[PDB]
Amino acid sequence: NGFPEVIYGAGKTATQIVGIVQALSQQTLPILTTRLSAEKFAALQPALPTAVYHATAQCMTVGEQPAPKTPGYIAVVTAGTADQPVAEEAAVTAETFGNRVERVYDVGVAGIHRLFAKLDVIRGARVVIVIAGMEGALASVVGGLVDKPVIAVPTSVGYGTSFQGMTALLTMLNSCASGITVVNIDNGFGAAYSASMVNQM
Amino acid sequence: RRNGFPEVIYGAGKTATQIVGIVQALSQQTLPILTTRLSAEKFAALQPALPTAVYHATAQCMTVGEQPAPKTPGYIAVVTAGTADQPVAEEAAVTAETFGNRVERVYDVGVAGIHRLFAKLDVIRGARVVIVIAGMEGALASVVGGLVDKPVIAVPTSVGYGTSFQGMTALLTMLNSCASGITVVNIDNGFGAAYSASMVNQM
Amino acid sequence: NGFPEVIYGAGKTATQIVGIVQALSQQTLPILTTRLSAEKFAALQPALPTAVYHATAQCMTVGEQPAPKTPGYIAVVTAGTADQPVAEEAAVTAETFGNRVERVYDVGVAGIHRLFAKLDVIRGARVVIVIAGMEGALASVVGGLVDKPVIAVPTSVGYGTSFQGMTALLTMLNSCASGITVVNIDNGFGAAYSASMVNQM
Amino acid sequence: RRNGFPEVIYGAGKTATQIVGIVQALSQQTLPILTTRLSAEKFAALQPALPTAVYHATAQCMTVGEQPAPKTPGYIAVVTAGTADQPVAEEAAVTAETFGNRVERVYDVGVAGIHRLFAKLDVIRGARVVIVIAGMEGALASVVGGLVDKPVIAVPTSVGYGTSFQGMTALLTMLNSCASGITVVNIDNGFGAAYSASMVNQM
Amino acid sequence: NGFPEVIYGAGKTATQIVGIVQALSQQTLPILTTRLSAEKFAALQPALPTAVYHATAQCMTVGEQPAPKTPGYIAVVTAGTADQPVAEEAAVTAETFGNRVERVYDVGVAGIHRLFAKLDVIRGARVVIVIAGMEGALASVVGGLVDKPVIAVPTSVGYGTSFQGMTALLTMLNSCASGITVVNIDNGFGAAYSASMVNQM
Amino acid sequence: RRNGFPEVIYGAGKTATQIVGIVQALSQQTLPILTTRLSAEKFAALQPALPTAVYHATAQCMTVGEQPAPKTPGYIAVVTAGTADQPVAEEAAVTAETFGNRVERVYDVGVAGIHRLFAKLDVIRGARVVIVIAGMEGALASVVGGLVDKPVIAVPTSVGYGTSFQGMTALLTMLNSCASGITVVNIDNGFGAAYSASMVNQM
Amino acid sequence: NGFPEVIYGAGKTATQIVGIVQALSQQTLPILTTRLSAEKFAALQPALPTAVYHATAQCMTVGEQPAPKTPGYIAVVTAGTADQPVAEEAAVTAETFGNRVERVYDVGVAGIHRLFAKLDVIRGARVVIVIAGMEGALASVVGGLVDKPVIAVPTSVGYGTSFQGMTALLTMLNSCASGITVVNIDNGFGAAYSASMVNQM
Amino acid sequence: RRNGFPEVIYGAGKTATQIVGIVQALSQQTLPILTTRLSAEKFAALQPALPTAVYHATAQCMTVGEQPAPKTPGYIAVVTAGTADQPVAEEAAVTAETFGNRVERVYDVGVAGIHRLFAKLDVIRGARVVIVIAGMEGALASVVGGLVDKPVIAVPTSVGYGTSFQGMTALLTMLNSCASGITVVNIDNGFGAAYSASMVNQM
């Protein structure tokens, strides 16, 4: 293994979270808490002063991460700014797992030139995580322009025929470019977990 | 007619011997007569019956009467994602040409090789209307829409296996494009798009 | 091109909106802000005094529109009053793009005589935008009575088997009348954007 | 019977040799015997077996015994959207006539040409019950419902390709009509409508 | 025709409602207002003192109904008490249209003996309206025990696989008993409208 | 075996020559050997190959070896809504009998004629487990469940046209019953129900 | 029969509940009230002092349960802690029906060793109730490891492709292991009702 | 190529005489040439045409040119739930071997008999990437994912009747796994998984 300790933040209370963190207090292992609301990080902030909270990602990391474990990096590519929350959930979990992360945000195919401008970075990552909602055309465009494993995270942003991520998920599952592999809606952590395993072979 | 255009005949309910009778009921006093979604077999059935009729095999459409030459200088670009889309692409391309519009075919420029789309980007941008035909994911419409300033009509096709859902995924992707300038028709409806593209191009 | 500046109003805050408007302050180009709530237009109204807000459409236009750019007009036809919000979103975006707009509201096929009464206007537009929800029979009736491009906007009004616009969308996609072409639910802007391109050839 | 009406026989599970046996089990001591959704082939299979039986090919229904003449002065209007709806239209029209009701057929008056519907509007308004049969979008029910003051029964049919969803879209459109006076049956269920229309007309 | 004036109560405000009622003040024709909330009937109750409000049905009737127009009656049969709101919407609209109404409530097939106990009444109506949700087995049981037109109203009560009435609607559409004819979810008015037309031939 | 019961063989992936080989791989040192969902043709294919094998045509199941006589005094009631349900009814009835349970068949007692259900209500109430098999609407489970104090297992079948959705509507209706005592299996899964009913009855 | 009195707690008010309990006051028969909110148990707690409330299960039992009616027991096995509410609804209803209940909670296949650790108990029950959501793989794993009737309850926990229990329900309906039999989402009572009938033959 | 790998050919749109022409268009100046989803009949059609071509019947794939021996010491584990998954398992196993990866096949270890999965657990854990292929419920991915520390790619297959929904239920189950390390592809897409597994293993 060699992964840190992860805490899910949805069904657990701010108290329950502190109790799990104090149980894993020894060893100086990094602890990640995902999907942790801002209000559920207010109550416990007096409890853990040495903890950091990534507001957009709703993730909280207590304990110093040492260096990256590999020189390579993972690129987190997003289609629109509405994707940045699950994107930062992915990028923060990857960085906590000891990965260098290069964020290429808001490069949707509506403005396709923006994506080509950052292609040198995207093509040089060991893994690419593409995060998009609405219509997941970005996963397919990037998938056909890189030669590295791509993990697609569809996002639940959007009303109507967006279906809170279903259309994006179906698009990514139908991606023409082979080598795209998909995770569940908003699962920015699960992508970074699989991406971290690939990067850190 | 309340829409001054050629005569159209469904083909999803009509038999071979019926097609001759339905065509002959509106034959002389009309423009060309077009028949869509007509089986590939019922053109041998009527080739002696309708000797002056033509059949476009891939398009599954039959045109009786002389096809009008382009009544307009502009052209309509029919852009296809993969070769599997050519049946509905040719239904659109034959429908457009029958209504008197020039067509420029840009086939198999799917987003997997975006470079291929850029190589033919000059022709696509030069059309007055663009018909983008795709399936599986249907991302080409979104990509083309954001690269052209002319009206785009997106046709999802039922091509594809698995979660393709016989065109539903492509239709949903196209309806949910962020690039504006995109209007959508029903799955495999290459005719309906060429019908609208013809009105835009005619104007 | 020759279109004005558009601002989406959903994910942006009233502050962020003013900052985008002040960045595009020079040139005297019209600026349109769509899907802009009444509460998100209260906060910024001291900021932009010269801006107008179309309450029903939730659209805000700062800067004087010059004349129409074409003598032709676009007809915005609605089935019921419940469709007027996305209708005005369409009509305001079209008028901001420099189109003359003729509004033919509340002519659903339940009272089909009302639609025939205004057919002289609908038939004389260069483009028709038909907006309906519940059951999109109006797009098909109008489509078969006009000889001009029709763009159908299904609306999300309604509960139960209305499916928040899905049934209307499917009906319009199955419209018997050829020449109907459909946009996404509530996308009054997208229809007016495509309609404006057609009208202003 | 708890519903004083003729004998009905499904045909979706029955074989040819079975249809003779099922009909003969309730033959003399009954009204006419009707069989719905019976294959177009298993009427040659039984035409010598049941020589006094009739078959309506388009309707896929077989009636043994003398059909009753209209026991009522009113009639039932069976209004169809396109010719593709005639199979379920005739299932409704043959079911209605077998129960002893006059039928006036108004076929192929879809909303694409609303003028056609108005030309036959006098006959439709004159019925005691109206059966509107349509598919694809299914807008005729809504249009007719708002133009008639008699009860309308709407039958969606599975006609149509693509997002037609084999009658689901039509069914949804009809259930979500704003014009009141409309009640709906299941897809392709031309019998169930004529069954209800017969009770209304009989009254 | 010969039906009263109907007012929909959903998209109209309590003020707008009073203005429509005062416009139809003359003739002494009954006016029905359906789907009219309790809070939207508080505000207008000083406006129309002579109006009655049926709380469960969310319907408001101003103006005296004269006698029934036919000796026959319509039976409103419900499966469970959760169906009573749309049931009373149906029964009140039918009674306002000049129909005698016999309410046979809470006779779901779970306790099938209760339904047989009231069968003498149900079988003697000119029309039967069966209202049920969850699983619409009651429409089919009654349909096969009566020889009169049945109109089925599926109701939106229930979570999970109830699908807010979809399962009930599909069951009723698949009713084995012929002569069932179905309306849209919760459309207690539409059933009573069609039932009233049948009863009052 | 971790579930002391006879040997079961899918039939949805197996060929005729394969069925003999799969049966012979677990033949002598076993209880009877049962094969479900096996084509009606691949029993002529093996009738000389497996001369001691029996085939129940309607059930599409083949049993090799002597069937055990009821090892219990109670019986399992297999209640069917219409004759169209007998294929999956017999899959359940043959599976139950192979496991050594008595079966009482109550076929075609759909809720359309509730009187028919009451006429055979004594036999149904007398079973230790009741299997209710229905489709289209699937109301019988709810009706039977509220009339019996023994455990009921409901099997939806894909019988039916239109909005029947090939068993989905029946499955949904049964899962959403108000009468308690009802547990549901997957569409057409007459085996899975008889498998559970056998364990309840055995106990 | 021989089952206690059950009261549904969803559509009934705290007052209506006390009135039903006082009507069934005589005989000293246990009374179970399911799906009874904490706020709907506050109001009535002065009314019934001798009643107990199972907070997690939202169930209230008034009246002393005598001994179990059978030496056998029913095992309630859950995949994650998020399943414990409907699990306790099942376990409390079973115990009120006179069954011994052995709770094997939070043994999802993610940590499959935990399930094998408690297999000796699960295999010795007369009936097994398996409760899971998200992906119902636990019903299938247990079903293939026991030789006793299993009743699967899918739970509605989860967003996105969880579909508020639909995916779990479909998985359990497709369980490879025969002998699984399924109930409706969250129907912890219905499983315990059928399980109690089996256990108490 | 922008992805340095062998030549791939769809087979869902291509005819026999077409496959020879499409292969010959990119034949000498390439790595091996692979064709997926190619009918089991159009290999007799081309076996004299392409005498140096091989066909894997179960996989429905044809490889022209010499297959590369493992260019890596690690292997890819292709784990199958039931024998009904072997067609898409072999599409994955043949795709992986063509790209130059060792494959260890672990077939028919469904969760019904978890003991079978543990007996081959050493081989599965020893792979650099694991491809888990399943249908019906698709629980194996979740079970395997929680027992291995290497990346798992889950392939749902359309195997199964009833509410299996032709792979939708399996796909949904796999996407909604709690065990992390699992990434999913589209239904029956054994190629797409072996394509990604090959890149991971190559690294």
Ligand SMILES: Nc1ncnc2c1ncn2[C@@H]1O[C@H](COP(=O)(O)OP(=O)(O)OC[C@H]2O[C@@H]([n+]3cccc(C(=O)O)c3)[C@H](O)[C@@H]2O)[C@@H](O)[C@H]1O
């Ligand atoms: N078995 C298989 N399953 C899934 N994908 C497979 C595949 N074999 C090749 N592929 C890959 O599919 C891609 C294209 O298919 P190819 O064999 O060339 O075939 P082609 O005829 O180009 O594409 C056929 C279908 O692909 C759809 N597509 C492809 C690419 C882009 C988009 C879009 O609209 O943006 C849509 C398109 O709508 C059409 O219906 C290639 O990258 C190829 O490697």
Ligand SMILES: Nc1ncnc2c1ncn2[C@@H]1O[C@H](COP(=O)(O)OP(=O)(O)OC[C@H]2O[C@@H]([n+]3cccc(C(=O)O)c3)[C@H](O)[C@@H]2O)[C@@H](O)[C@H]1O
């Ligand atoms: N009301 C409206 N309806 C439809 N389209 C509208 C629109 N307003 C702007 N747009 C257009 O859509 C774009 C959306 O951006 P904005 O609304 O500012 O919002 P932004 O945060 O940039 O993106 C919102 C969502 O769009 C998705 N997206 C965008 C672009 C391409 C792709 C892809 O994967 O290929 C996906 C992305 O996943 C994200 O969840 C705008 O740049 C504009 O061109």
Ligand SMILES: Nc1ncnc2c1ncn2[C@@H]1O[C@H](COP(=O)(O)OP(=O)(O)OC[C@H]2O[C@@H]([n+]3cccc(C(=O)O)c3)[C@H](O)[C@@H]2O)[C@@H](O)[C@H]1O
């Ligand atoms: N390939 C094609 N795809 C889509 N539409 C096509 C078409 N070819 C002609 N059309 C157009 O279809 C229309 C009618 O079809 P036609 O070929 O005449 O054929 P027709 O038999 O009149 O219509 C067949 C189907 O159309 C449905 N429809 C049509 C019109 C109105 C409504 C309604 O219920 O209100 C329903 C109707 O339910 C029936 O199932 C014409 O305007 C024609 O131009």
Ligand SMILES: Nc1ncnc2c1ncn2[C@@H]1O[C@H](COP(=O)(O)OP(=O)(O)OC[C@H]2O[C@@H]([n+]3cccc(C(=O)O)c3)[C@H](O)[C@@H]2O)[C@@H](O)[C@H]1O
């Ligand atoms: N409870 C009820 N359930 C079902 N139908 C009911 C109803 N109350 C009135 N109605 C009837 O439905 C009509 C709806 O109008 P109202 O409720 O006042 O409301 P209104 O705002 O006029 O329309 C509401 C919705 O109806 C849709 N509509 C109406 C008419 C035809 C079409 C079409 O496209 O063909 C669509 C329209 O898209 C809009 O979103 C009423 O005029 C009345 O005849």
Ligand SMILES: Nc1ncnc2c1ncn2[C@@H]1O[C@H](COP(=O)(O)OP(=O)(O)OC[C@H]2O[C@@H]([n+]3cccc(C(=O)O)c3)[C@H](O)[C@@H]2O)[C@@H](O)[C@H]1O
């Ligand atoms: N074409 C047609 N479309 C729709 N319904 C039709 C019909 N022809 C007869 N019917 C009516 O169908 C009813 C029964 O069908 P029949 O022809 O006798 O045939 P039968 O074999 O009894 O029923 C076949 C199917 O009916 C389903 N059904 C029927 C009754 C009750 C329920 C239930 O579970 O409670 C289910 C049952 O699940 C089975 O799959 C009769 O009342 C008959 O008048």
Ligand SMILES: Nc1ncnc2c1ncn2[C@@H]1O[C@H](COP(=O)(O)OP(=O)(O)OC[C@H]2O[C@@H]([n+]3cccc(C(=O)O)c3)[C@H](O)[C@@H]2O)[C@@H](O)[C@H]1O
């Ligand atoms: N938690 C639970 N989950 C599942 N079933 C449960 C239950 N609690 C009681 N039940 C049982 O279900 C019944 C529901 O009644 P209750 O919860 O008190 O509620 P009630 O208001 O009587 O009925 C609620 C809903 O049940 C529908 N229903 C009931 C009976 C039969 C039919 C039909 O059309 O055939 C439909 C009816 O349409 C209504 O919308 C109870 O009498 C009880 O036997």
Ligand SMILES: Nc1ncnc2c1ncn2[C@@H]1O[C@H](COP(=O)(O)OP(=O)(O)OC[C@H]2O[C@@H]([n+]3cccc(C(=O)O)c3)[C@H](O)[C@@H]2O)[C@@H](O)[C@H]1O
């Ligand atoms: N007719 C029938 N309907 C339903 N289930 C039936 C059955 N006949 C046997 N079974 C049972 O099915 C089970 C396996 O099928 P078998 O006949 O051995 O056949 P097998 O080839 O092992 O399985 C075929 C299918 O089962 C699926 N499955 C099975 C077990 C576990 C999982 C998983 O992914 O975890 C999936 C798998 O995805 C594959 O597509 C056995 O326990 C057997 O008793």
Ligand SMILES: Nc1ncnc2c1ncn2[C@@H]1O[C@H](COP(=O)(O)OP(=O)(O)OC[C@H]2O[C@@H]([n+]3cccc(C(=O)O)c3)[C@H](O)[C@@H]2O)[C@@H](O)[C@H]1O
């Ligand atoms: N954000 C995330 N997205 C996806 N997976 C995530 C995750 N965070 C943790 N996980 C993983 O998923 C597990 C879920 O547990 P946790 O979030 O703490 O929550 P917990 O309450 O243990 O379980 C939550 C839900 O998981 C379902 N579940 C869990 C395990 C297996 C099965 C089964 O039936 O086979 C089902 C169970 O039915 C319950 O409703 C964690 O132990 C962790 O390994």
Ligand SMILES: [Mg+2]
């Ligand atoms: Mg943006």
Ligand SMILES: [Mg+2]
């Ligand atoms: Mg290609």
Ligand SMILES: [Mg+2]
């Ligand atoms: Mg554009």
Ligand SMILES: [Mg+2]
């Ligand atoms: Mg109105």
Ligand SMILES: [Mg+2]
């Ligand atoms: Mg027509």
Ligand SMILES: [Mg+2]
């Ligand atoms: Mg009317």
Ligand SMILES: [Mg+2]
């Ligand atoms: Mg009750």
Ligand SMILES: [Mg+2]
């Ligand atoms: Mg029957």
